């Protein structure tokens, strides 16, 4: 006599189908990745670990960013201990600027060529310490020559003679009081107008007490624009103005992540989250819905078993 | 499955069948033996592997950060982003669940199908020389030695050669 | 369906079959009778119910308001939100349509499959004692009384017991 | 003779498949929910029906919100007749603030401890009536002691000593004219600076005629920030400033809806829209694409019939 | 396919079969002839056309511009929009790929199914008057002239009329 | 003997399935549209090709938009050479305003009825040339009667007596210097307050040097609001104010595209991108992910072949 049959095993794997839940098959395989590598796998990639340098700091240059003023990178890592500032302050449209810098590939600095007469240009503070009182490396704190002297209305223009847009940053200084502002820049209302070809905006300083951060109750507002090739930016100001010394140009392309784990140049990855790297051939992941890079699609399920063998019918 | 062989009129599988997915288990005067059929096995294996090759395909699309884990973005744009991301997650969780369920149904059904193709293949080889017993077996109405069995397994069985005896 | 039984070589259904999905309709010297087969019926029912259990599953994801029906949010962010929501609606309308169409094809095909499994089951019980007429019927070549019919329906029919008469 | 067959009915249901439109099956079932319950089914849920109180009003406290100054809720219902204000005005980033309050679970108020000397603190108007002229219950309208007296430059600071962020609200008063503003706060330009640790912003009042709303051509601009634990907010101002009296702390979690239908504590639901509640086991709905809660997915189709029986082939 | 006819026990197709999808190729004393079966062909054609009618359905949803090609919108809202649009593209590329792959599997399998329905139809017409050779052919054990062949093709073949000779 | 078989061809088409890549079938058809028509197929549709008129210009009326001050359209086409301005300047929330105008169906203008006394109303410039110096056709440049004369504080109100919202536009003029601004409007800080019922905002001009665009280092800031039926807008200003002469009302519905290709009234389409029209019965397209209208879904694949025949097994 001759008989036809099929194989089976003592312990199969249960899977789900359209018509039944928990059908046992001879073998199955996982489609959802749960295994994380708790490092930033960066083998083969120009990596910049900003550490204590905040990403926006690379444009203005507080001391913690001196090593990063012209960085070049394929992968940019922000750290939780990063600070963008030394003299307290904050950027306008800060997140827009971060997203531009995360994908820039790094920055290339170039002097914009502003010269001054009739003012001081060496404003410094003990909050930006470089073996003494200093300031942002890419900026110039413009002052009256002497206390309460009038800050002359002045005009400074810069033409982007290069072929890619120029990142221009300036600052508005808000002293701790109306009285302190007059010693720095002279009395009266002070105004800074910014205009180019696709941008126009005015700024007036706002002196007043603020909570003391880094010993100071004053703050600097940092503003920026992208200046197109062959376009000109013109600054008209009469005080409380932190002038740009260099413009920034974007090098190419990169990606930025925010992580709390070490760099590992011995693993290779393309999908990152704050806890490390997702290295997987699987189409789905249940690790972090905010992972970035080239990633498996985040799904809410921890497991989706795909049958790789026939139904298991044991004896 | 849809083809009512595996877990159907064939009662259960063979845990001793360790060299293939499907096979023949014979009995004659020389005793009993079990051997695997390679062609049916590899057909099923090739089809499941093709499914796997589809599923381990690399997404070549890069996505970048649009919010901030250290310094939360403005609330309203953050609520829009979270809602968008949660909606996409809804869609991909649904797709993953449906994909695996559908693919598992088809894998089970395809394995069922290969069993039936093998059974009918043998049935058509044996012609009028055997009768099906309803359990996946063919009652052979002639003396079928080990070489005779081997010829059934590798498709060299000549039904005419035994036709006279078997009908008789 | 894919299995060419229902709406296939079986001409139509029985509106008098009110106690099951599939069944036997017999005729002998004692007259005609119709009874339902429970096993095939429950297999089909169990599979459709499993589909239903999948579809009535609760989404456990909460979504909150991101615009305003009484005080419209700013136009640009509102246009982004409306576009996102309309894109998701596009995706879910497509998924719902595809899901139901696919599931209906498979439900119809699965019901077709259970009919064929029952037909072949009976065929294999009857062995050489009957011939198929091509309409879902088995011409019985022996006297088959009501108990004989009942034994076919509940799988206690011994083909050997009638073998001698039927071939004759 | 013995025959195999299948069942049929006189009237089947038509469905759609991949290969055919309008195939008749023995039975089918609907997957798209169209039936709405025209009430807010709130059984089992701490519910707050704001009625005439606008959600933002619960922070500042116009009269219509006196009963809601420290509400607690799992479900918050805004009504079309709700008003956030009594003295006319509007919030900056109002929708961001609404979304925060809809999911807060309610608010817990606490005095911030500002004391004043050399000014009036009891500014009132007949637009905020409580058995006479009154003001926002959570605010203080700061004035000069007498007409045209100078409002002294003043500084008030508040430290969040609690463990969750503090919602701080203040207001900028724009009188109907430059002349009216000097009687309230003294002449000259007036400035209010707001600073904390992650926030810095200045405000100068803008007197002028506005259409008369509630009898007034003046308005109050309400501003807010969230103050982190152990962080400090400092207000520097010299007039036109509506000071906060209490800070708000969020209780937990909730959801907010906007409805025009009654509350029903006898039906249970988790999916709401303005017309009521969607209670359904179905995976899809064709009722409202803006439904919120735990909902079936909105689809454009009114009906998608799922086959639950074999093909119907009648005689 | 799942039904092991096309590219299965039927060895290959007929490039000379230009008037239908499936057919009969006969040989008798009058010679050989090939004709197409219309019913099976049109069943397959009708099913593929139904699939096509589903796929050429018009999306009646209008989407409008939410960014600007001449004057780029603000960077942050632009990054949110680009991410949303790229996520939707991810979803629709996945759906298109899956849809076509699934539909192609089913089209191939459905064509395989129609071949088997035709083969079994003929088998059931011929009853005990023929035997299957395993290659899609029925060995006819009686003289079957051109009219006899024509009656098989158009379902007017009376097995009884030849029963006596064929068994003999 | 009688044999069953199936058809085949010498050259089939390869397609993909769930279990196999590159399976040959007898016939297949494309599902992804790649063929573009390099024109704006506009047969049957009221079309406005703005050409050198920028869409926002249709509200304020620089010379290039004189023909478009009250346009009516189902389809609005913006061109790369379009300009919204003559006197240099830019709109606040410009893209929000463009999206409103793209779907408006056109605009219907109506005089708002402002009359003036004690000022000049005929401010003109050689940058808005109509056979000489002119200005925006829908605006009025308000000036002091004579140089350095004081611009009187003034109030102008407009009630929307119609049944749909009124688009109100005004402008803030920033002269090239503080000195030029005083000749136009008189000395001192100048303020314009805008208030309605759901809007309140103040503006102060910012004189200063800007790069010269169209010969001018001055600019005009254009602002807008939508005024609800029966609601009133009130302008309080003392100079540097570009007053609206007419309000705009939206006609109905339309769609707007940005294109660089000619109009063809002999092809019909509903899916547009900058390179032309996508006319297709296919469900997917690989042409432009930013196409608008009623479109096939954009997909990344260039081809997805759908089997329309059986597997091809040749001899
Ligand atoms: C959008 O969603 C994210 C979550 O994906 C929200 O950010 C998350 O905010 C929650 C609080 O609402 C944070 O939870 C906290 O987790 C830490 C443990 O790591 C601990 O402090 C507590 O357990 C607390 O629950 C969570 O860390 C944070 N996650 C991320 C990635 O940001 C975010 O608030 C949402 N957006 C908006 C605008 O609300
Ligand atoms: C985003 O989409 C919503 C619709 O889902 C738009 O809000 C809707 O706006 C329309 C007018 O454009 C309103 O239609 C009106 O309906 C009422 C009847 O209830 C009546 O006044 C008229 O029949 C009129 O057509 C509709 O009520 C309103 N619905 C909601 C829920 O807000 C909204 O404008 C879109 N967003 C943006 C920024 O445009
Ligand atoms: C969102 O995505 C769009 C692309 O879909 C980005 O706009 C695109 O920006 C790139 C540069 O980043 C432009 O590429 C350029 O193409 C032209 C050739 O036509 C030429 O100048 C160079 O080859 C250059 O690579 C592209 O034209 C442009 N396309 C469109 C439709 O805008 C946009 O930047 C992204 N959004 C944000 C906020 O970044
Ligand atoms: C079971 O499945 C996985 C994935 O297909 C495979 O790696 C593994 O080797 C399989 N094991 C057996 C015994 O088939
Ligand atoms: C910029 O100006 C120079 C003239 O000095 C010209 O040659 C160049 O092509 C211009 N580039 C662009 C992008 O306009
Ligand atoms: C038809 O289908 C629905 C849903 O499956 C079910 O509730 C109903 O009882 C069914 N009726 C019959 C007669 O099967
Ligand atoms: C806040 O400060 C107190 C010291 O008074 C400290 O004990 C507490 O841990 C601090 N909390 C945080 C969150 O920094
Ligand atoms: C092949 O398929 C396409 C689309 O279904 C059709 O237009 C064409 O006529 C077909 N050709 C043949 C020979 O079937
Ligand atoms: C506007 O006011 C008039 C009274 O002059 C009134 O008849 C009309 O119904 C009002 N319309 C609305 C929308 O309030």
Author numbering:
A (entry chain A), D (entry chain A), F (entry chain A): 12 to 141, 143 to 158, 158A, 158B, 159 to 263, 265 to 276, 276A, 277 to 325
B (entry chain B), C (entry chain B), E (entry chain B): 1 to 168
What is written in the article reporting this PDB entry?
To effectively transmit between humans, the virus needs to acquire human-type receptor specificity. In this study, we show that recombinant H7 proteins need three amino acid mutations to change specificity to human-type receptors.
We also determined the crystal structure of the Sh2 V186K K193T G228S with and without avian- and human-type receptors. The V186K-K193T-G228S mutant also showed dual receptor binding on chicken and human trachea sections. The Sh2 V186K-K193T-G228S mutant lost almost all binding to avian-type receptors, and binds with higher avidity to human-type receptors than the wild-type Sh2. Interestingly, the increased avidity of the mutant was seen primarily for extended α2-6-linked N-glycans, with 3 or 4 LacNAc repeats, with a 2- to 5-fold gain (apparent Kd values are given in S4 Table). Sh2 exhibited a broad thermal denaturation profile with a melting temperature (Tm) of 55°C, while the human-type receptor specificity mutant (Sh2 V186K-K193T-G228S) had a slightly lower stability with a Tm of 53°C. Thus, while the Sh2 V186K-K193T-G228S mutant exhibits human-type receptor specificity, the thermal stability is, if anything, lower than wild-type Sh2 HA, which is not surprising since mutations that increase stability are generally in the stem region, not in the receptor binding domain.
